[PDB]
RNA sequence: CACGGACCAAGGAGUCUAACGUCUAUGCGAGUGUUUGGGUGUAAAACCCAUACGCGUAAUGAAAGUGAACGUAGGUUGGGGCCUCGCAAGAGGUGCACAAUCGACCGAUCCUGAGGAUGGAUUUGAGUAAGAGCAUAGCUGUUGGGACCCGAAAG
RNA sequence: ACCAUCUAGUAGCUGGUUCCUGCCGAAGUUUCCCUAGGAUAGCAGAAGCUCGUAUCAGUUUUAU
């Protein structure tokens, strides 16, 4: 049972890998490739009003 | 290390999650049953022994009788409005003393007291 | 316990905002610092240090920057 | 005799590639060293204090000279000044950017560099001890 | 027996190099 | 300078306000990192089993 | 009443 | 503020936005510039005639 | 020579853990590690955090104790590179890291008397000479755990 | 004498140790603690500073 289950990750790389994976959103390329039907979208990012 | 036969003894803390949750249920139930009062009582300033560490300032068990007393009521009164009250605790600094005289006036008037009945 | 301090890490202690206004007294018992130490020279600004030990080479180096030190009790 | 970097950044080939191409298509020696330097491992890439960099721009006529590093530039705190010059360096730390900044100076990074010298004119090579660290 | 025998050989190869 | 995008509707109509980007998308993108932080953060839900 | 652990 | 921009540091404690290592991530343009153009030699065919 | 082999299906042998170490990769950087804990939550997930603490940021001696700039942090021989002249050879200036030599400074050192005092003979500590560290992932070597697997006269 | 645990006991040991391809590629040996059990060199690599130069050679010749 003591087997390393839980890996320790630090704070800031987890905040950059964050960071990147919420910048390849806006890319609009690799969106594409991750097998989403955003061709039809009118733009990316897409942002909707508050009332949402 | 391992003259022993630990390996029958190996305690793994899986259970961090579920007892960090069962705390707070416990301290949620706490509340509830102490709604009007703070889950904890009030604790005064101290300073710490240990030279190494006299820098630091850091809380305490209870006040002093002389605090207390300082502090325009009684001990045994004192502890049933939550003030811990210390019966061993000596006072032997000044600056300490007026603090902690001080943090008991402003708790004895931020705090209100609903009728006994 | 006796931790020791640089001349040079000593105004690093100041806050930043401060040490541009300033280029004082500095209190190295809170920053976790007993004895203080000389490396270098500080630039010639007067600083006040309050230490429990300093050291007589880095007391020159305090005094030749017009700086003076203050002893605990 | 290296062929490629063992690093895995995106960015990091990139640079790669374009100083590659670079030393192909002009052959100039800073383009070959910086290349060199760039394979470098972390251990053997050590970083270049900002006090080392003031060090080389108050040399003889170094102040007019660019400043270039290949590791990873350091803020110091042993000098509350620093000569007004151009630094480059792969990546900038916080203190040492904020300092650069604050002394009139800039910190463009190594594209940037190629781009303003692509012969490697003007330019200036330092690298943080080895043998130090240990 | 075999792994007996073969047993008994090696012991006497181990002792005629060291013996 | 930083891009703007128009806040489009819940019927999918533009609307005429537009906000600027964050710049959370200008930060480099690092698929080698993501990938090695991904690794090791979806461990942190496993449950321990032994014989 | 004591300072809590952790930010708000 | 979830993330900090150049005004806003970061609103968080003792962290900040990451920093690019390369200004530009298009190395065709890099290539194509003037400075670089006038500093490199003529290219050859880019398939050696089969002599001999 | 010998140990095993009548044949077939399944099972079956360098796996895990604690410490130390080189190398490689990522993160921050004279700082670094959030997750012992608190807040929070779509509830063992994920996201943040006060104060302390592990390491380094400086060492030395059996000990109280002391504690690293005369110099542009030190002169020379060089030394990846840079600049000037040189349409090339080549000449000059600059000198990164780094190797050598002669120097400076910190602990102690054997005396030297200006009362524990000035300098030197010099030894020595991986010491300083503008810090180079801390966190995570991978291959990898050693030690103890049953430790590549079955098996030995037994208390 | 037998039954169940410490015990999956104790090794200087008998037996075995599982998919494919390419490249490189040994020693079978010196020294030294006065040894039965290896401590150190060399043969093979790995990483960096230089150097691609006039650094060398299981080779031959000439002056002493």
Redesign the pocket.
Known sequence: T???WN??????????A?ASAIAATAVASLVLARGHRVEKIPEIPLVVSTDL | H??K???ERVKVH????????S??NA?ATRAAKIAPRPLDLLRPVVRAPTVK?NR?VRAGRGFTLAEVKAAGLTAAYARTIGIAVDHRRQNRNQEIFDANVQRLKEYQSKIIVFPRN | W???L?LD?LW?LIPEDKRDQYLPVIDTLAA?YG?I?????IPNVPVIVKAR?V????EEKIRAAGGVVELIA | H?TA?????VY?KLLVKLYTFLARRTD???N??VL??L??????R??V????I???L?????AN?TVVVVG?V??????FEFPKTTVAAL?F????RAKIVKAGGECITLDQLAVRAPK??????????????? | ???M???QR??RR?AKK?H | SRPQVTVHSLTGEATANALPLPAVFSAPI?P??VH?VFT??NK??R?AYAV | LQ?????? | QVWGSETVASS?????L??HIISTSDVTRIINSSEIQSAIRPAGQATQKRTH
Request: glycine share 8%; no cysteine; charged share 35%.
């Open positions: 003591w087997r390393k890996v320790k990750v630090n704070h800031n790389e987890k905040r950059y964050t | 391992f003259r036969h630990w390996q899986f259970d961090q999650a579920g007892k960090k949750v705390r707070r301290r560490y630091k | 006796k931790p020791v640089n890490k690093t976790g004895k130490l000389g490396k270098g020279r030990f050291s007589k080479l880095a | 290296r970097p063992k690093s895995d950044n990091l100039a020696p800073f070959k060293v060199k330097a394979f470098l491992s972390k251990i053997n050590p970083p204090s900002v006090s080392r003031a060090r080389a108050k040399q003889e006529g170094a000279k990873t350091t803020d110091d705190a042993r000098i990546r730390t916080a203190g040492a490697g004119q003007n330019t200036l090579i330092l690298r943080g001890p080895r043998n130090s660290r240990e | 027996d075999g792994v025998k073969n047993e090696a012991l181990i060291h | 690092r080698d990192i090695t090791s953060v942190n839900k449950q | 300072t809590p652990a952790g930010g708000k | 968080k404690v003792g962290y900040t990451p920093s």
